[PDB]
Structure formats: structure tokens, C-alpha cells
Amino acid sequence: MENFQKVEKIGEGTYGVVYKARNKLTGEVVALKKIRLDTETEGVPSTAIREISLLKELNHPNIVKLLDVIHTENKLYLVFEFLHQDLKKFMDASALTGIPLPLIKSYLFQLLQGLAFCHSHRVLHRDLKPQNLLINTEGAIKLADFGLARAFGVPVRTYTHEVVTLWYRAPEILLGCKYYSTAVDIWSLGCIFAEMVTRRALFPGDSEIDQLFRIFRTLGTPDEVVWPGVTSMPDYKPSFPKWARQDFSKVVPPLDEDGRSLLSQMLHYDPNKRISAKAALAHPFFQDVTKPVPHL
Amino acid sequence: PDYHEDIHTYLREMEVKCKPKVGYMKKQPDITNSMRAILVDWLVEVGEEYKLQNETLHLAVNYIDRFLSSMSVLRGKLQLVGTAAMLLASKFEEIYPPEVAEFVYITDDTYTKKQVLRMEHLVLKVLTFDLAAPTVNQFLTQYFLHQQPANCKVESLAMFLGELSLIDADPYLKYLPSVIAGAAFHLALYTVTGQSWPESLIRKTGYTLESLKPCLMDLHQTYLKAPQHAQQSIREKYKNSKYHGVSLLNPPETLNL
Ligand SMILES: Nc1ncnc2c1ncn2[C@@H]1O[C@H](COP(=O)(O)OP(=O)(O)OP(=O)(O)O)[C@@H](O)[C@H]1O
């Protein structure tokens, strides 16, 4: 920890502080994540065990790079590559200038590459949200915060229900599905996609029930034609109001026909029919993809 | 089948990377295959008492074997290693892991909590945090998707036999989880239905009945001698109706290979 000089505190989570730091010997700017160990009570936090072990298996240009783990008797510090800011902060700062479409498309192409890599190596992220996605000065974006990720199995089994941040939470989970897999992460990126475009949250529910109502008000209330098995889901209610699906021309007006088509496949009710990160990369929307540097 | 082929290929690669040293017991001046057998059988019992996943058990044995590939352990510490490993497998795999005090309680106060917490950290450091190991159970789960139709007895019997493999370092340390899984499935299928390692799995794994034969030879023997093994917790576990009483079934006298 001697090679490192703290520059500023850039964050705080449940098990310790986040720092911008600089390697005094190499000049490398990093993020230090400090994790307190419960030396007399619970030991190393189960969230840090998954996060470290999963992130060490995940070496891809669109996933935050874990550079080192520095042990002491009383702390862990995870050394991460430094990334300028999160997507939430960038969208917010872009209130008056907007975000260029080619930047939105490039970012989405990258998130999907990061995501296909995870799923390829049997990792669900389970907390995709703008706050958890990191951009640099040069036009790259990366999946970060692997605190809620887990290694899956084929076929999946019952995993933790209380998982995803509500606005990003897939309808199969909200209806208390026994099983969720890769499709839950595609949902969240669908929500992120529309939010990059409108720059407001697609479905900002107040609670689980309200979360569903908001989804149904936009996408149409699901039935058995569109989603075999909905009506037999544990938290399904035959009394749900029957809303007609709105035009995506109205849900995401700036979006072209290609983008609308992609958003629509990412936000398919039936998790089985919702597109894979792998398949989404082949969508015509990405035919003209470039890599703009953002104004920062 | 979303990423089914990508995942399988990647697991095949990763099992070689998390492979314990085949010859490590002979290099442990103070511990034996028989002591290791006692340890795992006890962990099987911890696994039943705390209603833990089967994958947690499998993960813990991988962790133990890798640790014991790297460090000399005295026999009075063998159990401290096994407990910390079960604890780390729990944190990794379980939705609701037992708390650390329960891990101390199961060793019936052989060690303190501090001991168990310091061992946990020593174990992480020795494994350099590489915890996401492929298991026999991971490969079996994938193989089960190549049934038509799924047969519950075949599945429970395949699990039972994959789990017996955990107990005996001789000879199972020389096979890869995917190989033990292939032996377990074929033998389980052949025992319930009379069928053989499906062509879909040969195309998947590139394992034929002949390449599976050495393991299958060993595993069949283990299946035959199971009622007379010193360690018995897995048999007792697999008589429960939860596993369709499959340890009460009779092994074939021949395989015909
Ligand atoms: N590598 C990094 N580069 C730049 N900023 C980072 C980095 N890691 C974390 N941050 C900052 O900290 C915030 C969140 O960090 P992160 O989500 O990794 O930790 P956390 O919230 O404590 O989650 P957990 O401890 O559960 O993994 C972000 O909004 C970001 O501003």
C-alpha cells in the first residue's frame, strides 16, 4: 500500500471506501476499493469473494480490469483501472447538450460485447444500471461493480430473488419466477438503452406492483399468446389492468426503425424469446457503429 | 441452449486450471488418503445437516485438494482446512450460507473462531481467490439436458456416484470432473434403463465409451464395494426419498465394454 498515494475519495459502499489513487512508482492512476474484513466475526464478505473470483476470470476490454488484490490481516484493497466517471453521471452532466446517437450506439455495442463475454464465461451480473457502468475519456464503456454477480450453471437453478435494482428489474423476477438466467441482464440493458436515448428512466416504479404497472402501460399487458406461462407465475394476478402496447415511435421518439427493432427484442416479456447479447451484436442497428470520444 | 456450447468449452478449459496435483498425498508427510476420506465424508454430513447445495460440497473438496497440493498440513489441522473450505464454498455458492459460528460449532470446539477466520484468509491467498471451479455436478447438470426424456432415477444415481468419487483421492484425483461426470452418467443410465453414453454427448464432449473406460472401470468398482466402504454418509444420504432411494439400487455385475 506504500506505492500508492490517495488523490481523492471517489466513493463509498457497504464494506468500505473507494479512492482515486496514483502509483508513485509507475504514474498509473487507479481506483482503490477498500474492503474491511470482520476479523473477529464473519471474515471475508461473501460479496467480495464472488466479486474478486469472478472478475479475475473476466478479461475483456469492456469489463473493468481488476489489476491487483492487496491483502493485510485487517483489510482487502482491490486495485482497479481508473475510469473517469459512471454513465449515470455522464447522462446527468449531458442535460443541456444531449448525447449524440453515434455515442449511444457505440456505448450499447460495447456493453453488449462486455455482456456476451460474461454470459459466455457463465457469469450473471445481476445489477446493470447506469451507476455501475464506467466510461473513459476516449469513448470506451465498461461493465463494473461485480458485487451481485454469480457464476451460473446449465441449466440455471434457483438463485437469490432480491437481486436487481427495481427500475432495471426484469418482469420474470417481479412475477417471482423460480428461475432466471442471462435474459435478466439483457432486460436491464434494454432499460439502459432507452434511458441513454430519452435520458430519463424507462420504468421508474415506486414498488414491485407499480414497477409491473409501468412496464405493462408501455409494452402492453402480457397474455399467454405473447408469453406462454405468464398467468401461472406465482405473483401473476388475473385482475391486472389490460393496457394496449404503445408505439415505440412515442416511447423512444429519437430512435430510428433499426434501434426500435433492437430495443423491442431486448424488452421481450418471454425471457426465452428476448434476444441474447451474442445475437444482438449481429443486429442491423450496429452496421454503421463507430467509436466517438464523448465531450467531457 | 443460449450459451450452452460457449459455457461447456470454457468449463473444459477451466477444469484443467483448477486441477489439483494427482500425486500430492505421497508428498504430505502426515496426512493420508484415508484421513482425507474421513474429512470429505464428514463434510457430506455437514452438507446434509445444514441443507447445503450439492455444488457447495463439490466446491469445498476442490478447495481442499488445491490447498493440500500447496501446503504441508499436520493431521490435527486437517479439519481446520476442511471447515474454512466449506465456509468459503458456502459464501461462494449459497443464497443463505451458515454463519461462521455454526462452522465453529460443527468442529465441536476443536478450533476457535479466530482460527477458522484466519484459515479462511490463508485458504483464499493459497487459491489466489480462484474459487469458481468446475465440478462433477456442473458437468452432470449439462449432460442431463441430453436425456430424452429426463429420468429422475438416472439423475439421482448419476449424482450419487459422482459424489462417491469425492471420497477416494485414489483413484479419482487423476480424472477431470468432466470425465468422472461422463462415467457417472453412463453408468447411471446403464444401471437404470440399460442405455449407453448418448451420441449427443459424444458429439458434445468428444468423449467416447472407450476414453471413458478407465474411469468407468474404477467407478463401477466403487459402486460394487460401496456397502463395505468405511465411509457411508453418501449412501445414507442417497437412501432419502429426496434422491429417490437410489443408493438402495443394485449395481450391474458387468458393463459389457
Ligand atoms: N475502477 C473505477 N474507476 C472509476 N470509478 C470507480 C471505479 N470503481 C468504483 N468507482 C466509483 O465508485 C462508485 C461505485 O463503485 P462500485 O460499485 O465498484 O463499489 P460499491 O458501490 O462499494 O459496490 P460493492 O462493494 O458491492 O462491489 C461509482 O459510481 C464510481 O464513481
XYZ file of C-alpha atoms and ligand atoms in Angstrom:
584
model
C 0.000 0.000 0.000
C 3.121 2.241 0.277
C 3.415 2.507 -3.611
C 0.037 4.230 -3.540
C -0.851 7.907 -2.993
C -4.530 8.775 -2.324
C -5.714 11.609 -4.572
C -9.414 11.940 -3.604
C -12.270 9.825 -2.191
C -14.420 8.922 -5.162
C -16.975 6.644 -3.499
C -18.337 4.562 -0.621
C -20.133 1.188 -0.453
C -21.311 -1.237 2.243
C -17.849 -2.736 3.148
C -15.583 0.318 2.629
C -14.402 3.402 0.738
C -13.363 3.930 -2.936
C -10.253 6.051 -3.834
C -8.644 7.606 -6.860
C -5.010 6.881 -6.295
C -1.775 7.059 -8.094
C 1.070 4.580 -8.321
C 4.013 6.628 -7.085
C 6.489 4.399 -8.894
C 4.752 3.966 -12.345
C 2.483 7.064 -12.528
C -0.550 4.803 -13.101
C -3.874 6.214 -11.927
C -6.085 3.551 -10.297
C -9.298 3.056 -8.258
C -8.691 1.536 -4.801
C -11.618 -0.276 -3.318
C -11.126 -0.789 0.392
C -12.928 -3.801 1.908
C -12.952 -4.167 5.700
C -12.599 -7.695 6.979
C -14.675 -8.827 10.052
C -11.552 -10.344 11.640
C -13.353 -11.469 14.831
C -16.837 -12.109 13.424
C -17.748 -13.006 9.832
C -14.388 -12.893 7.923
C -14.190 -12.021 4.218
C -17.543 -10.757 2.901
C -19.250 -13.195 0.514
C -19.817 -10.276 -1.935
C -16.083 -9.650 -2.098
C -15.309 -13.387 -2.611
C -17.695 -13.530 -5.671
C -16.576 -10.090 -6.973
C -12.819 -10.891 -6.861
C -13.013 -14.501 -8.115
C -15.477 -13.581 -10.900
C -13.622 -10.501 -12.063
C -10.327 -12.418 -12.191
C -11.867 -14.772 -14.747
C -13.195 -11.860 -16.828
C -10.625 -10.332 -19.044
C -12.308 -8.234 -21.667
C -11.875 -4.622 -22.885
C -15.495 -3.765 -21.879
C -15.248 -5.102 -18.325
C -13.407 -3.128 -15.605
C -9.949 -4.506 -15.062
C -9.052 -5.801 -11.637
C -5.234 -5.171 -11.507
C -4.355 -6.499 -8.078
C -5.635 -7.654 -4.646
C -3.572 -6.336 -1.755
C -4.032 -8.317 1.458
C -3.452 -7.282 5.029
C -4.501 -9.006 8.310
C -7.370 -6.390 8.573
C -8.318 -5.107 5.053
C -8.527 -6.061 1.393
C -7.810 -3.410 -1.236
C -8.896 -4.167 -4.751
C -6.844 -2.205 -7.297
C -8.863 -1.392 -10.415
C -8.047 0.548 -13.564
C -9.276 4.123 -13.174
C -12.237 5.165 -15.256
C -13.260 8.851 -15.485
C -16.930 8.554 -14.417
C -20.074 6.402 -14.404
C -22.802 6.516 -17.116
C -25.333 7.978 -14.690
C -23.006 10.962 -14.004
C -22.301 11.406 -17.668
C -26.088 11.375 -18.644
C -26.773 13.930 -15.842
C -23.901 16.229 -16.974
C -25.421 15.938 -20.504
C -28.792 17.533 -19.500
C -28.256 20.609 -21.752
C -26.146 19.260 -24.722
C -27.746 15.857 -25.165
C -25.949 12.635 -26.104
C -25.093 12.086 -29.811
C -26.750 8.965 -31.260
C -23.410 7.523 -32.554
C -22.112 7.727 -28.972
C -25.270 5.952 -27.670
C -24.915 3.170 -30.280
C -21.140 2.717 -29.635
C -21.778 2.504 -25.866
C -24.540 -0.091 -26.335
C -22.351 -2.178 -28.757
C -19.643 -2.179 -26.059
C -21.925 -3.032 -23.135
C -23.253 -5.958 -25.235
C -19.713 -7.163 -26.014
C -18.870 -6.932 -22.284
C -22.117 -8.774 -21.549
C -21.776 -11.586 -24.112
C -18.281 -12.148 -22.592
C -19.771 -12.556 -19.085
C -22.507 -14.865 -20.190
C -20.004 -16.874 -22.352
C -17.961 -17.495 -19.147
C -21.144 -18.374 -17.200
C -21.399 -15.101 -15.145
C -24.665 -13.197 -14.489
C -24.028 -9.559 -13.499
C -27.440 -9.036 -11.921
C -27.068 -5.261 -11.198
C -26.757 -3.482 -14.509
C -27.619 0.173 -14.125
C -26.060 3.398 -15.322
C -24.369 3.936 -11.877
C -22.490 0.621 -12.460
C -21.230 1.242 -15.986
C -17.951 3.135 -16.410
C -16.765 5.416 -19.195
C -13.276 6.761 -20.115
C -12.023 9.973 -21.887
C -11.532 8.071 -25.095
C -15.017 6.625 -25.882
C -14.943 3.269 -24.117
C -17.503 1.989 -21.651
C -17.141 -0.932 -19.241
C -19.207 -3.123 -17.001
C -18.323 -2.603 -13.409
C -19.443 -3.398 -9.869
C -19.478 -7.176 -9.825
C -20.807 -7.207 -6.195
C -24.090 -9.014 -7.151
C -22.739 -11.298 -9.887
C -22.807 -15.006 -9.641
C -21.412 -17.989 -11.546
C -24.339 -19.862 -13.146
C -24.844 -23.459 -14.152
C -26.533 -25.121 -17.125
C -29.470 -25.288 -16.648
C -29.682 -22.481 -14.034
C -31.041 -23.195 -10.599
C -32.989 -21.029 -8.029
C -30.755 -18.027 -7.266
C -31.295 -15.058 -4.849
C -34.635 -13.341 -5.539
C -33.795 -9.918 -4.029
C -31.362 -9.025 -6.716
C -31.704 -6.294 -9.332
C -32.289 -2.531 -8.739
C -36.071 -2.022 -9.266
C -36.100 0.216 -12.404
C -33.862 -2.404 -14.149
C -35.624 -5.458 -12.792
C -36.983 -7.911 -15.352
C -40.708 -8.815 -15.310
C -39.966 -12.592 -14.827
C -38.304 -11.697 -11.481
C -41.098 -9.319 -10.442
C -43.617 -12.121 -11.072
C -41.495 -14.331 -8.759
C -40.011 -16.759 -11.326
C -38.269 -19.770 -9.704
C -35.600 -19.376 -12.367
C -33.798 -16.504 -14.019
C -30.776 -16.549 -16.302
C -28.954 -14.329 -18.864
C -32.215 -12.694 -20.004
C -32.414 -10.634 -16.782
C -29.203 -8.736 -17.758
C -30.493 -8.066 -21.331
C -33.653 -6.523 -19.802
C -31.573 -4.096 -17.739
C -29.532 -3.105 -20.848
C -32.795 -2.588 -22.715
C -33.783 -0.162 -19.974
C -30.382 1.499 -20.119
C -30.619 1.767 -23.948
C -33.925 3.812 -23.811
C -32.602 5.901 -20.921
C -29.454 6.868 -22.971
C -31.867 7.918 -25.703
C -34.517 9.818 -23.676
C -32.144 10.404 -20.821
C -34.886 9.607 -18.307
C -35.574 6.187 -16.774
C -37.753 3.985 -18.910
C -39.743 2.455 -15.985
C -39.166 4.234 -12.613
C -41.591 2.260 -10.437
C -42.339 3.093 -6.810
C -42.620 -0.583 -5.753
C -42.869 -4.094 -7.275
C -46.592 -3.791 -8.140
C -46.074 -0.295 -9.507
C -42.924 -1.477 -11.373
C -45.085 -4.037 -13.238
C -47.852 -1.438 -13.939
C -45.290 0.842 -15.548
C -43.898 -1.933 -17.744
C -47.435 -3.062 -18.795
C -48.539 0.572 -19.514
C -45.732 0.796 -22.168
C -45.320 -2.738 -23.549
C -48.915 -3.903 -23.272
C -50.145 -6.231 -20.584
C -48.699 -9.719 -21.335
C -51.040 -12.613 -22.071
C -50.461 -16.323 -22.918
C -50.154 -15.589 -26.693
C -47.166 -13.203 -26.181
C -45.797 -15.050 -23.100
C -46.647 -18.750 -22.629
C -46.823 -19.343 -18.898
C -47.415 -15.798 -17.559
C -50.797 -16.491 -15.970
C -49.277 -19.377 -13.956
C -46.468 -17.324 -12.433
C -46.503 -17.102 -8.593
C -47.102 -13.327 -8.441
C -49.301 -13.069 -11.508
C -52.761 -11.521 -10.975
C -55.710 -12.088 -13.369
C -57.014 -8.662 -12.191
C -54.096 -6.763 -13.759
C -55.464 -3.987 -16.000
C -55.148 -4.744 -19.759
C -53.173 -1.964 -21.315
C -52.548 -1.696 -25.023
C -48.860 -1.512 -26.076
C -47.689 1.978 -27.137
C -45.790 2.769 -30.370
C -42.042 2.821 -29.847
C -42.123 5.965 -32.016
C -43.670 7.509 -28.857
C -41.684 5.596 -26.169
C -38.335 6.453 -27.781
C -39.012 9.163 -30.401
C -35.371 9.946 -31.487
C -34.853 6.309 -32.350
C -34.777 5.014 -35.911
C -36.501 1.857 -37.119
C -33.410 -0.381 -36.556
C -32.968 0.872 -32.935
C -36.669 0.464 -32.238
C -36.411 -3.139 -33.516
C -33.435 -3.862 -31.248
C -34.992 -2.208 -28.125
C -38.131 -4.269 -28.732
C -36.167 -7.595 -28.850
C -34.270 -6.632 -25.633
C -37.539 -5.967 -23.818
C -39.459 -9.017 -24.859
C -41.577 -10.373 -21.995
C -40.765 -14.069 -22.595
C -37.194 -14.416 -21.339
C -36.700 -17.256 -23.766
C -37.640 -15.033 -26.758
C -35.679 -11.953 -25.548
C -32.504 -11.621 -27.632
C -29.054 -12.752 -26.397
C -26.124 -10.319 -26.090
C -24.446 -12.596 -28.673
C -27.327 -12.250 -31.189
C -27.838 -8.515 -30.521
C -24.311 -7.803 -31.760
C -25.457 -9.037 -35.239
C -28.495 -6.639 -35.377
C -28.543 -4.135 -38.332
C -28.563 -1.255 -35.813
C -24.820 -1.928 -35.447
C -23.943 -1.963 -39.195
C -22.631 1.639 -39.016
C -21.134 1.587 -35.459
C -18.153 3.891 -34.767
C -16.384 4.885 -31.577
C -16.856 8.613 -30.829
C -14.965 10.276 -27.961
C -17.537 11.965 -25.652
C -17.318 15.678 -24.866
C -16.001 15.713 -21.282
C -29.244 -23.677 -25.312
C -28.303 -19.931 -25.140
C -24.556 -20.056 -24.378
C -24.514 -23.815 -23.721
C -21.599 -24.559 -26.064
C -19.596 -21.494 -25.069
C -20.012 -22.326 -21.397
C -19.071 -26.064 -21.773
C -15.894 -25.222 -23.754
C -14.912 -22.655 -21.177
C -15.531 -25.126 -18.284
C -13.383 -27.707 -20.085
C -10.581 -25.186 -20.157
C -11.147 -24.067 -16.520
C -11.178 -27.622 -15.019
C -7.632 -28.128 -16.268
C -6.640 -24.845 -14.488
C -8.254 -25.726 -11.118
C -6.871 -29.289 -11.241
C -5.243 -30.499 -8.019
C -1.926 -32.305 -8.166
C -2.600 -36.029 -8.728
C 0.299 -37.120 -6.532
C 0.007 -34.779 -3.504
C -0.783 -37.276 -0.720
C 2.520 -39.049 -1.064
C 4.115 -35.566 -0.562
C 2.084 -34.878 2.663
C 4.340 -36.339 5.435
C 1.485 -36.533 7.913
C -1.790 -36.990 6.114
C -3.327 -39.834 4.092
C -5.982 -40.768 1.548
C -7.863 -42.469 4.423
C -7.786 -39.254 6.514
C -8.907 -37.259 3.506
C -11.785 -39.798 3.039
C -12.864 -39.201 6.659
C -12.786 -35.407 6.136
C -14.984 -35.423 2.971
C -17.465 -37.899 4.442
C -17.829 -35.501 7.428
C -18.312 -32.540 5.026
C -21.030 -34.604 3.253
C -22.712 -34.798 6.741
C -22.283 -31.035 7.389
C -23.788 -30.624 3.904
C -26.910 -32.623 4.904
C -27.292 -31.113 8.391
C -27.246 -27.512 7.067
C -29.249 -28.333 3.917
C -26.494 -27.029 1.730
C -26.390 -27.362 -2.057
C -24.522 -30.329 -3.515
C -22.341 -27.931 -5.546
C -21.082 -26.357 -2.287
C -19.793 -29.753 -1.185
C -18.087 -30.346 -4.562
C -16.585 -26.832 -4.460
C -15.183 -27.469 -0.958
C -13.422 -30.673 -1.977
C -11.745 -28.879 -4.932
C -10.643 -26.168 -2.489
C -9.229 -28.750 -0.010
C -7.323 -30.652 -2.663
C -5.755 -27.487 -4.145
C -4.691 -26.255 -0.681
C -3.160 -29.646 0.106
C -1.361 -29.545 -3.256
C 0.401 -26.390 -1.994
C 0.941 -26.736 1.802
C 2.020 -29.348 4.301
C -0.704 -29.729 6.875
C -0.391 -31.549 10.175
C -3.161 -34.069 10.843
C -4.643 -32.023 13.790
C -5.114 -29.139 11.319
C -6.672 -31.213 8.522
C -10.101 -30.389 9.909
C -9.391 -26.584 10.163
C -8.674 -26.573 6.388
C -11.863 -28.554 5.579
C -14.066 -26.198 7.711
C -12.672 -22.969 6.172
C -13.033 -24.524 2.713
C -16.723 -25.456 3.429
C -17.178 -21.895 4.731
C -15.685 -20.307 1.556
C -17.662 -22.731 -0.708
C -20.784 -21.635 1.239
C -20.116 -17.924 0.734
C -19.450 -18.535 -2.942
C -22.332 -20.841 -3.672
C -25.188 -20.398 -1.148
C -28.001 -17.822 -1.094
C -28.049 -18.201 2.757
C -24.653 -19.571 3.873
C -24.325 -20.680 7.513
C -22.728 -18.041 9.701
C -19.170 -18.535 10.956
C -20.262 -19.569 14.482
C -22.044 -22.614 13.005
C -18.809 -23.583 11.240
C -17.086 -23.457 14.664
C -19.914 -25.356 16.289
C -19.625 -28.335 13.786
C -15.912 -28.875 14.601
C -17.253 -29.397 18.169
C -14.867 -26.760 19.572
C -11.650 -28.357 18.265
C -10.734 -24.843 16.972
C -11.580 -21.232 17.857
C -13.495 -18.855 15.610
C -10.317 -16.767 15.070
C -8.613 -19.989 13.890
C -11.443 -20.603 11.404
C -11.316 -16.944 10.250
C -7.537 -16.863 9.810
C -7.692 -20.200 7.876
C -10.331 -18.800 5.573
C -7.983 -15.939 4.641
C -4.967 -18.338 4.357
C -7.076 -20.528 2.020
C -8.067 -17.532 -0.235
C -4.416 -16.491 -0.507
C -3.318 -20.038 -1.394
C -6.017 -20.308 -4.044
C -5.241 -16.698 -5.117
C -9.023 -16.140 -4.962
C -9.643 -18.639 -7.805
C -12.873 -20.063 -6.483
C -15.103 -20.515 -9.457
C -14.013 -24.174 -10.038
C -15.908 -26.531 -12.414
C -17.256 -29.535 -10.556
C -18.534 -33.006 -11.387
C -22.005 -31.633 -10.605
C -21.553 -28.728 -13.090
C -20.815 -31.196 -15.964
C -23.607 -33.626 -14.920
C -26.175 -30.807 -14.967
C -25.186 -30.053 -18.555
C -25.229 -33.742 -19.571
C -28.785 -34.143 -18.139
C -30.069 -31.795 -20.903
C -29.113 -34.584 -23.376
C -31.727 -37.002 -21.976
C -34.951 -37.963 -23.824
C -36.841 -37.888 -21.665
C -35.273 -36.729 -18.354
C -35.159 -39.651 -15.931
C -35.096 -38.808 -12.201
C -33.557 -42.070 -11.122
C -30.810 -41.723 -13.701
C -30.176 -38.169 -12.415
C -30.064 -39.018 -8.707
C -27.925 -42.116 -9.410
C -25.504 -40.099 -11.518
C -25.198 -37.534 -8.671
C -24.695 -40.352 -6.100
C -21.793 -41.868 -7.979
C -20.165 -38.509 -8.805
C -20.314 -37.852 -5.068
C -18.756 -41.176 -4.105
C -15.812 -40.137 -6.299
C -15.248 -37.206 -3.914
C -14.305 -39.606 -1.054
C -11.400 -41.537 -2.626
C -8.442 -39.496 -3.783
C -7.072 -42.805 -5.101
C -8.006 -43.053 -7.871
C -10.276 -40.044 -8.583
C -7.642 -37.250 -8.402
C -6.270 -38.499 -11.770
C -9.539 -37.772 -13.631
C -11.085 -34.487 -14.659
C -14.551 -33.596 -13.413
C -15.990 -33.880 -16.970
C -14.582 -37.421 -17.201
C -15.930 -38.558 -13.800
C -19.238 -36.926 -14.898
C -19.280 -38.968 -18.151
C -18.573 -42.199 -16.217
C -21.258 -41.295 -13.648
C -23.902 -40.541 -16.270
C -23.251 -43.592 -18.497
C -23.070 -45.947 -15.521
C -26.202 -44.383 -14.020
C -28.112 -44.577 -17.266
C -26.926 -48.145 -17.910
C -27.958 -49.177 -14.416
C -31.483 -47.765 -14.536
C -32.532 -48.208 -18.209
C -29.840 -50.352 -19.903
C -28.927 -47.438 -22.278
C -25.413 -46.090 -23.042
C -23.498 -42.799 -23.314
C -25.669 -40.973 -25.907
C -24.312 -39.931 -29.308
C -25.330 -36.288 -28.496
C -22.874 -36.390 -25.573
C -20.121 -37.909 -27.743
C -20.625 -35.028 -30.205
C -20.708 -32.565 -27.194
C -17.761 -33.732 -25.109
C -15.796 -35.705 -27.672
C -15.696 -38.464 -25.086
C -16.410 -41.975 -26.355
C -17.179 -45.021 -24.250
C -13.553 -46.114 -24.732
C -11.996 -42.857 -23.458
C -14.458 -43.087 -20.521
C -13.441 -46.667 -19.904
C -10.594 -46.419 -17.344
C -12.681 -44.108 -15.103
C -15.787 -46.201 -15.745
C -13.808 -49.286 -14.692
C -12.828 -47.611 -11.395
C -16.257 -46.121 -10.764
C -18.064 -49.447 -11.318
C -15.725 -50.973 -8.701
C -16.594 -48.146 -6.229
C -20.253 -48.763 -6.991
C -19.827 -52.522 -6.227
C -17.855 -52.074 -2.956
C -19.945 -49.120 -1.624
C -21.839 -51.038 1.153
C -18.447 -52.125 2.526
C -16.578 -48.755 2.369
C -15.531 -47.310 5.817
C -17.260 -44.019 4.860
C -21.022 -44.329 4.462
C -22.615 -40.864 4.701
C -23.194 -40.599 0.931
C -25.110 -43.954 0.804
C -27.186 -42.922 3.820
C -27.826 -39.542 2.163
C -28.938 -41.220 -1.110
C -31.493 -43.564 0.585
C -33.677 -40.493 1.415
C -36.678 -40.213 -0.899
C -35.229 -36.787 -1.887
C -32.821 -38.822 -4.025
C -35.477 -41.457 -4.972
C -33.686 -44.042 -2.719
C -31.098 -44.652 -5.451
C -28.322 -45.939 -3.137
C -30.581 -48.942 -2.385
C -30.448 -49.971 -6.101
C -28.091 -52.808 -7.147
C -25.038 -52.251 -9.372
C -24.744 -54.409 -12.536
C -22.268 -57.295 -12.394
C -20.935 -56.314 -15.862
C -20.798 -53.280 -18.123
C -20.052 -55.019 -21.463
C -17.320 -52.755 -22.821
N -12.488 1.439 -11.361
C -13.164 2.582 -11.098
N -12.903 3.718 -11.786
C -13.564 4.864 -11.539
N -14.524 4.986 -10.604
C -14.893 3.930 -9.825
C -14.208 2.635 -10.040
N -14.742 1.767 -9.161
C -15.684 2.442 -8.452
N -15.788 3.736 -8.835
C -16.736 4.750 -8.255
O -17.482 4.197 -7.159
C -18.873 4.043 -7.484
C -19.340 2.590 -7.358
O -18.251 1.665 -7.189
P -18.553 0.083 -7.025
O -19.987 -0.021 -7.484
O -17.474 -0.737 -7.702
O -18.418 -0.174 -5.420
P -19.616 -0.415 -4.336
O -20.769 0.526 -4.635
O -18.982 -0.316 -2.963
O -20.155 -1.940 -4.605
P -19.638 -3.368 -3.998
O -18.733 -3.049 -2.825
O -20.910 -4.085 -3.611
O -18.946 -4.056 -5.153
C -19.087 4.559 -8.906
O -20.202 5.472 -9.005
C -17.765 5.208 -9.297
O -17.899 6.641 -9.344
